[PDB]
Swiss-Prot record, chain B:
Gene3D superfamilies assigned to the protein according to its UniProt record, in alphabetical order: Phosphoenolpyruvate-binding domains, PK beta-barrel domain-like, Pyruvate kinase, C-terminal domain
Cellular component GO terms, alphabetical: cilium; collagen-containing extracellular matrix; cytoplasm; cytosol; extracellular exosome; extracellular region; extracellular vesicle; ficolin-1-rich granule lumen
Binding site for substrate: R60, K237, G262, D263, T295
Modified residues (S-nitrosocysteine): C390, C391
Positions annotated to bind K(+): N62, S64, D100, T101
Cross-link named Glycyl lysine isopeptide (Lys-Gly) (interchain with G-Cter in SUMO2), sites: K102, K233, K237
Effect of substituting P375A: Significant reduction in hydroxylation and in PKM-mediated transcriptional activity of HIF1A
Protein name: Pyruvate kinase PKM
Site (Transition state stabilizer): K237
PTM section of the record: ISGylated.
Annotated site (Crucial for phosphotyrosine binding): K400
Transport listed as a keyword: no
InterPro entries per record: Pyr_Knase (IPR001697), Pyrv/PenolPyrv_kinase-like_dom (IPR015813), Pyrv_kinase-like_dom_sf (IPR040442), Pyrv_Knase-like_insert_dom_sf (IPR011037), Pyrv_Knase_AS (IPR018209), Pyrv_Knase_brl (IPR015793), Pyrv_Knase_C (IPR015795), Pyrv_Knase_C_sf (IPR036918)
């Protein structure tokens, strides 16, 4: 009658679908992490507190724009909002900070010297592209400067050039030395500093530009939790970011953004090298035909679920909400289906960065994800995850799968996991329990980074280390108990699964207990 | 390396997903019917010609607005466009006409009082709101919610006392929705009665009947359509809680279903619409009755030449869910890019159809398939099993009424179902079913029936060769019957293409 | 090894295709072997070899023998079993089972002799009498039997079967105190042979005066279980339960299903019983012989589904009464009982009176071990978990997690500390591949555990240590030492360990994955 | 009826749970019964009863008996069989199978004693406690120190300790005799594919027009190829069934199967060569691989052994028969039970009764799902038509699948998908009719009606003959739905048409 449990018990997926029930309400816990891009509509301490209350788990900073001073202040503000709740550790919600790199972008110049000016473009008309910096702030209906120095070499005649999220389409007629002449194949308003794509072209910008170097250094100085690396093409790109981050940034997670055809093709090597993946559908759906994006998304989510590495679904998930308080039916569907596909996290960009309804957008992602989570066909999912798993003598892995089996058997209210590094909780998440995973840690970075994983609710235990280690273990379990009760995941006398190890330190998780809530 | 054949052979759905390949191009055939709403953007004969070339299969006329004269001219223009291709039956594509009814409506005329007092009819303001639904008090209790102007405003409860739960600009003659209520307005309005007669007179192929709440609303629509309209398909629009809850009885009485998501997401929480969509698609798939996914599928294309990433995903996921048809409303009625919208649904649908996990899907449709002594059903399942076993280029079905080809479609073959018919209405109505590619044979009835049967099979061979579904020497499946007339399909053959 | 290539197959057909005669099984054998004890196997000396050969349960057939005789058999089984108690690592618990006579029909003596036989010829006449003057004067013309009411339950046309159904008779005339019959299947007729009336509704009591005395004797002798013969319905089981009473309340009642009504009323019988015997001997006389595999598979499935022990019995290695090795059908029967899901398999004449009792035990051991490895655990465990219920019981949740974990790491064993056996029973019901080493201090728990597939019971003799954590470890390390000594695993393998959070029954909640020291 | 409650279960466990002794099977029994003919069964009058009791194939064991003797058996088989010929509606074809002697090795022993094996022909007539002569000249090349040697159907076990001779130690002792059979477990025995006697016997089989050969001691594909060569052009249509009898045969099973027309699981000899506890693994592997390949497989040896002396079988025997069928065996077999026993007719009837019960208890839902999943997409029309027919047969629970066939092949292709419905294979070819018995579910009927002058009418006459057969034998009745398979032109290789038709 609740949590789509009648659908959960179907012997076929068709029957599962037939039993999906709009009158079967979900549980409290939402498992899929929500990443919100911060910008002018959401960077105030005031709004950020409401973002957090509304379900934001990760704050994304887009380094395609803005100065270090600006990003430093956003980061300061996220931390002020986040620590405003720290006085009761039981109700404190950790919040991660993500740096999203500019990476190898092509950008246009300023329309008539203004960052906000635009010119309407009639379809069929003519337009000159120039690399002459003379016109870098004098773009208009007739001449359009962009910043890719090498553009003329990697494009031939008849090549297609796309501007502003692929919405403006241009065809190369004649090649010059510092220029291109083009006809507006598809028209609309042209604005300032818009993204440009050359889908037919072997673009040769570096993996990690000088600007990216400076930004990644700022990321280390600012103690960011993860980097979302733009336009990753191959494993060596990932290795370059990892080496750039170097020793000071060794614990920073690298999520590779797959946004072009080469990244999809070389996906397996990229995943191996990365800490996680973002399906960056914006650019991806300009670089490859828009009608193939769902194939790429489902392939990458599947391969990440198979590897146990976090995957993020991104871009235009609730786009209409930039201007409207409720989303379109396609948007509702997109969010639900990302969760049903297996995505660990879902993302907001303009919806939270600049839109008129940032909070409504976060709340809608929260609502849809929780409904979709209840609609998952765990019976087949869990069977297939168990089947496809390399079978190993690893005792931590055996403990994790037993816990998840145990949690299904008793419909547990949670799987409580003590973890220093997060790994033990990550191992549970990989097997996709219905039960929320309460990951208890003293490590603040573990607690923030754990939001990358479906089902993990990180809680940051601030209690002092007790002299007797068994009493210290029991202290943290009890903390987890108090957190679940306060958030309404479970109540006195419900059963929960508890995972602990046999000695202190990382790598010893080997003990699964089935315990009633006190 | 074509048609996601690699992913097709996976032992698990997870491995199927992992094998999906953006570099594995689909075959030419696109199976999912595309329904386009016609309006100022798309109504001229020349544009309609291009709409058909772009992939429109069904022209939807929204009777919520427009005169009979207007709609009659729209239908005439659809038919001029469609018949401009009639000279070559091998390439001719039938186009269906669908009449989507206005249906029963509630219309208007902090703290706010709702009054039914018709002296307050033209005296609407911030203290007094008049409504035209006299039974509203029977249907709503204390605490019930009331939405105004397609959801824009929110309220809580021969008079009603209400606090305004979500404010806005309140206008004249606005739509009202009563979430969770058993609305007892008649199954059909006065206008609807007249529009349905017009539909019959104009020889429309199907009716999309609005705001269907129970089996008896369907029976009423059926009764209005009457004997002259007995062959017109009734597709029930499920738009509110009651229709979802009483889905099984509606489905049994209907020819098929529309998941009317626009109205559904005003009536039920927006975050639950996907549940209702997936339930209805699965139940229609289990019954073998056509289901249409509707509303905002490519909505940004009203203004823009490319869709959003969520819209791309929505179309694909509707197809993967099992929807027989996908629909366009404003995108084709009013938008700046109608042709591009139709083309994008075609491209996505075709990719999605190749990505289907047929191995589990057919296995489950088998398992849930009732054992009956019906010969046509046994022949259909055999033909679909045979088509997977030999990777046939098509399944060719001779059909008078469509039913034989519908029975094949419900088992969801990968191979296109070429439904050869001499009945023009059957050829139009067949677009409602996933996988059916209808062809209208215009050749005279040969004196020897055996030869007239072979003439039609050979017609289907010429269509597939011309359209690039298969070539000489490929194997196709062919369904025929033991005598003339409907109901006798019992013969499945594996035949080389000549 | 262990048919692990076959185990990994994604279909049953492919699993079959991968079964490999060159993939040796593990040392552990999970299916209990029940051996009927008689003159071939009763001496302490021979009982010691029975135990070493793999016997887990000694069955005593109360269809024959006096209480004085059966008390001596029990004493001998206990003396043989305790001869191994000096080394607790190699001690094997052995259960004692009492199989009731029940409502049997028996013929009299051929010409005053226990061994004499006469030949009955097809078509000849044979008169059945109830007159006790002929009780010891049966011959080819006159056959006495002890069912006084037989004339009221048969008609003309009725068939009457004698001697494991090998001799058959058709009633030509009903008299008042007799029946005139015609021989259909002839053969050698001996003394005191079992009789079946498949058509008839036999009205002998489910629990006779003699059965009552025998069940009271079972209680007094501390038997582990009772196999109740000819159970027809739930109330029959309740009559046995009533006789065992409060004092016999921990004795397991295994209902023997050996007639048509027992099969028909199976579900109510199982609900009332602690387990089932597929008593195939009488069963294949009471119903058509070609239907017995149907009843066997039905009963084994229903028992596996209910989580109740089920025993496959009768003629499994029959030829081995006379020969040192079995027929191919017999080889197949034993393997297929195990593949069906039988917790235990049984030997009757093979061990009671045959010439090769030790060989018959060894052979059941060898075949069962091979069959166990060949089980398709992938589908079995998936179905057991689906068909089980989602429940608020924390011990069930831990049991199913311990089994799942055992598959993931291909554990050497699941080690379970248990007082009453229930926690190890809960693991067994999920059919892990890993042997379940059940460590108990309770002697009866230890013996009765043999009724569950996969459980290797070990009886801990060490006194309770004051420090409970240390007492837990003591028993876990004892299990480790048994596993190494029996070759189940070696140092550095991984095993699953199940304990509770405190001492006493009913707290099993802790699963650990630990290396073998 | 027909365990149809059990047939609908969603799991195998629930399928087991619903098996019902009071759910009676249909009339049709699908599993062929192969009966060894000998003193007990060889008279024309007994052979008539054997046919009426369920015999489909008469096996002749050429390990003993003269060509004259066997010729007379064959003659009697055909006399009994043709006595039913007057009514083709009711006529049951009976096949004749020739089972070869095959290669052999021939020659009180105390446990722990030392015994020398000599190939020194000196001691041909002088074996004893200390020296034992063998006729296998290459024995030393195929055995190692530590190799086992079994003597006389496994009674005696020797182990090699030093390798023209071998010094062995007795491991399992017993009474040694003259001319006792020898087996070499795990060895690659290099004896010829066929003995000189086998070659003569195989040519006699061609003379006598036998339907199939059961070739003894098949170890490798080349063994099958040599049997095929001996049968030659005149014998090219005779089915070769390889008897798998030892470790090498089991290990080289894939190549043997590909080269053969089918397999016998030769459990008697296999349980001498390999540990008896492992024989069930060998059987289940070979039956599984035969099902996957669509080739007939026979289960043999001791299936109803106790019935040589008794009129009812043991419970283990009943179980073995039912389990061979549930394993997927196309045929089951009787040896001494029919050749020499006191109850030949009862043994045949009991295999009939068990088989039919077990066929109803099959879990077709999972079985059919897996066969399709493991069966390649190919462009072959007959295969596609065949799978379509079986699917259609399940969807309407048809009374039969009627298949016209010249060679048998179209019917064989249906049989591999394991329908519940009997497959009535209508042919004009008498050898095809007899050979069809090798395949689970095929009831071959031999049509003797004149060829009609319109080919489509001649097709229809054969379809209606099958209808009369099913009606006459109680498989179905007027108004039942049956599946019919035919082709688009005459001659083999063109079956492509599936129709669902009411029985007239």
């Amino acid at each position: 009658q609740t949590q789509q449990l009648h659908a959960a018990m179907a012997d076929t997926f068709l029957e599962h679908m037939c039993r999906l029930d709009i009158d079967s309400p979900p549980i409290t816990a939402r498992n899929t992490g929500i990443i919100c891009t911060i910008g002018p509509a959401s960077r105030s301490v005031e709004t950020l507190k409401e973002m957090i209350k509304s379900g934001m788990n990760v704050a994304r900073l887009n380094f395609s724009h803005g100065t270090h001073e600006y990003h430093a202040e956003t980061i300061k503000n996220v931390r002020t909002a986040t620590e405003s709740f720290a006085s009761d550790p039981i109700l404190y919600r950790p919040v991660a900070v993500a740096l999203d790199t500019k990476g190898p972008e092509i950008r246009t110049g300023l329309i008539k010297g203004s960052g906000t000016a635009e010119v309407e473009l009639k379809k069929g008309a003519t337009l000159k592209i120039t690399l002459d910096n003379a016109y870098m702030e004098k773009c208009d209906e007739n001449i359009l400067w962009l910043d890719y120095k090498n553009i003329c070499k990697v494009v031939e005649v008849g090549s297609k050039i796309y501007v502003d999220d692929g919405l403006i389409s241009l065809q190369v007629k004649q090649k010059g030395a510092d220029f291109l002449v083009t006809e507006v194949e598809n028209g609309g308003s042209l604005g300032s500093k818009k993204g440009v794509n050359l889908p037919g072209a072997a673009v040769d910008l570096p993996a990690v530009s000088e600007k990216d170097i400076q930004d990644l250094k700022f990321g280390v100085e600012q103690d960011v939790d993860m980097v979302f690396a733009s336009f990753i093409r191959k494993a060596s790109d990932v290795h370059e970011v990892r080496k750039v981050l170097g020793e000071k940034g060794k614990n920073i997670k690298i999520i590779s953004k797959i946004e072009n055809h080469e990244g999809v093709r070389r996906f397996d090597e990229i995943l191996e090298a990365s800490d996680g993946i973002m399906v960056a559908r914006g650019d991806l759906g300009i670089e490859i035909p828009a009608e193939k994006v769902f194939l790429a998304q489902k392939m990458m989510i599947g391969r990440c679920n198979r590897a146990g590495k976090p995957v993020i679904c991104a871009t235009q998930m609730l786009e209409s909400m930039i201007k409207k308080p409720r989303p379109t039916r396609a948007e509702g569907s997109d969010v639900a289906n990302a969760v049903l596909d297996g995505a660990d996290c879902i993302m907001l960009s303009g919806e939270t960065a600049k839109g008129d309804y940032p909070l409504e957008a976060v709340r809608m992602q929260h609502l849809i994800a929780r409904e979709a989570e209840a609609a998952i066909y765990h019976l087949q999912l869990f069977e297939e995850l168990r089947r496809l798993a390399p079978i190993t003598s690893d005792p931590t892995e055996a403990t994790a799968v037993g816990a998840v089996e145990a949690s299904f058997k008793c419909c547990s209210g949670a799987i409580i996991v003590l973890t220093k590094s997060g790994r033990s909780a990550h191992q549970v998440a990989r097997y996709r329990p219905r039960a929320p995973i309460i990951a208890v840690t003293r490590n603040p970075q573990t607690a923030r980074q754990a939001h990358l994983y479906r089902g993990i609710f990180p809680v940051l235990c601030k209690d002092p280390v007790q002299e007797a280690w068994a009493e210290d273990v029991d202290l943290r379990v009890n903390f987890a108990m108090n957190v679940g009760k306060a958030r309404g995941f479970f109540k006195k006398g419900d059963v929960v699964i508890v995972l602990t190890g046999w000695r202190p330190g990382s790598g010893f998780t080997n003990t699964m207990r089935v315990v009633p809530v006190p």
